[PDB]
Amino acid sequence: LVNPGASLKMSCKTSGYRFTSYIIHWVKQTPGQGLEWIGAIFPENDDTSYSQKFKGKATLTTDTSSSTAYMQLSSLTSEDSAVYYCARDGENVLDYWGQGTSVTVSS
Amino acid sequence: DYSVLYNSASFSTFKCYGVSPTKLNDLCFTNVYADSFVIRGDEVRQIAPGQTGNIADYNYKLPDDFTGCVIAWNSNNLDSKVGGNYNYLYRLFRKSNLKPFERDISTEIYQAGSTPCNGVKGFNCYFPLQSYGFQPTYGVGYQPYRVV
Amino acid sequence: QIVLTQSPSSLAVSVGEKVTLSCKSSQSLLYSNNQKNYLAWYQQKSGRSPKLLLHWTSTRESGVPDRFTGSGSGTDFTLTISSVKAEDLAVYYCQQYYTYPWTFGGGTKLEIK
């Protein structure tokens, strides 16, 4: 539960697979709408990649010791509430596109 | 004569693998080579038969067994600069590995993602050759060490 | 910022019936150096993680039935499924793989008539 303008942090860890991927991905899908790409993360130098629509609202941080990708969401709105899915990208898919967490935004 | 090059009191470190440093004085050798290069301070421990990382795997690959010595000293003067070193470079990432005793002189672009690089950059196409940081005002791990 | 257009809105397919779904890209997703089309096909069952079915439009995913076959030339990309089953029904999407920014132009619900 996040009020409009609140900051939300989401973390996911790959299970059964130990790193071995050169990209990580974030997707926002509202129910009844198609998946929309947000940002891509790089294991070494930070990719710092953001979609133009989500630019300035999304921050990407990766910690090797934590082994979990971090996404920070700011200026949340009723339209913003959606299911966000942690994902990755190696050659194709290797159990890297994980599940999603529902977000509800209300005062 | 490898006896006068051991007690010369002009080297910082002198580690020998396999061959003892007191037995090569009277031992015959077929071919003797020397790979002279300068690295950072933290990269000195990586030069060993059996290590891994981003420098000992993509730049200078070392075999599993080594029958020789590792000569490395400190300069930090007569060379280097104040405020940053902008003279030498070193490869960081590489899409493919390298066999031991092999030199890579190709200025390729590392492909992190699935988009084709080599020429076009902007996203998932970073520059592998990085710059050093030889500054005499830092500590010990940031000094240039010439490893031969 | 190439948006991808995918049609139709709905697909009515009987069990054991071949179906063809096509996604059109505004710009060709073939890289000149490799001369290879870039695109990804995704399956989206309800309450399930997004899953890649076909990659590059030339290579099937590991542990994926030969019934799912995709052929794409230039801007036009086509995915053909055969012997459709109740488990198979899902939303189908086309993801551009050619260049950043990534655009999800996928978009086709699958239903059983």
Q: What residues of A are in the C interface, CB distance below 8 Å?
A: 27, 34-37, 40, 49, 51-52, 85, 87, 91-93, 97-100
Exposure on the CB side of residue B126, measured as CA atoms within 13 A: 20
Stretch (H or E) spanning A30: none
Q: Are C70 and C78 in contact (CB under 8 A)?
A: yes
| C75: nearest Cα among C61, C96, C60 | C96
| A66: Cα separation from own chain's centroid | 16
**CA torsion, points B90, B92, B94, B100, in degrees to nearest 10?**
60
- Backbone region of residue C97 per phi and psi (left: phi > 0; alpha: psi in -120 to 50; beta: other values): alpha
Which residues lie across from A83 on neighbouring strands?
A29, A102
CA distance B43 to B54: 10
CA distance B43 to B66: 18
Helix, coil or strand: residue C69 = strand
Per the entry, the structure determination technique was cryo-EM
Evaluate the omega torsion of the peptide bond into residue C65 and state whether it is cis, within 30 degrees of 0: no
Q: What residues of B are in the A interface, CB distance below 8 Å?
A: 92-93, 112-114, 123-124, 126
In a mutational test of the A interface, the residue from C7, C55, C102 whose CB has the highest number of chain A CBs within 10 Å is C102
CA closest to C36 among chain B residues:
B116
Question: Residue ranges of the domains in chain C?
Answer: 4-112
Task: Compute the residue count for chain B.
Answer: 148
Query: Given in angstroms, what resolution was this structure solved at?
Result: 3.2
CA distance C50 to C91: 10
Looking at beta carbons, which residues of chain A come within 8 Å of B113? Answer: 22-23, 40, 89
Work out whether strand C10-13 and strand C109-112 pair parallel, antiparallel, or are unpaired: parallel
**Per the CB < 8 Å rule, is B122 touching C97?**
no
**Chain C nearest CA to A59, separation (Å):** 16
Q: Are A92 and C61 in contact (CB under 8 A)?
A: yes
**Domains in chain A: ranges and CATH:** 8-102 (2.60.40.10)
Task: Compute the residue count for chain A.
Answer: 107
Task: Compute the residue count for chain C.
Answer: 113
CA closest to A29 among chain C residues:
C50
Q: What residues of C are in the B interface, CB distance below 8 Å?
A: 31, 33-34, 38, 97-100
Outline where C1-110 has alpha helix (H): none
Helix, coil or strand: residue C56 = coil
**CA torsion, points B112, B118, B120, B126, in degrees to nearest 10?**
40
Smallest Cβ–Cβ distance between C93 and the set A34, A40, A98 belongs to A34
Q: How far is CA C35 from each of CA A92, B85, B116, B140, rounded to the nearest angstrom? A: 19, 41, 11, 51
Exposure on the CB side of residue A15, measured as CA atoms within 13 A: 4
Looking at beta carbons, which residues of chain B come within 8 Å of C33? Answer: 116, 118
**Chain B nearest CA to A98, separation (Å):** 18
Could you please state the CATH topology (level 3) that the domain comprising C4-112 is classified under. Immunoglobulin-like (2.60.40)
Looking at beta carbons, which residues of chain C come within 8 Å of A98? Answer: 49
- Which are the contacts of C53, defined by CB distance < 8 A and separation ≥ 6? C41, C42, C43, C61, C64, C68, C79, C92
| C52: Cα separation from own chain's centroid | 9
Exposure on the CB side of residue C74, measured as CA atoms within 13 A: 2
Q: What residues of B are in the C interface, CB distance below 8 Å?
A: 114-116, 118, 122-124
Q: Quick one: CA dihedral B113, B114, B115, B118, positive or negative?
A: positive
**Per the CB < 8 Å rule, is A23 touching B126?**
no
CA distance C93 to C51: 10
**Chain B nearest CA to C31, separation (Å):** 8
Quickly tell me which residue has 């303008």 as its tokens: A5
| C67: nearest Cα among C50, C47, C87, C49 | C87
Quickly tell me which residue has 């950072």 as its tokens: B40
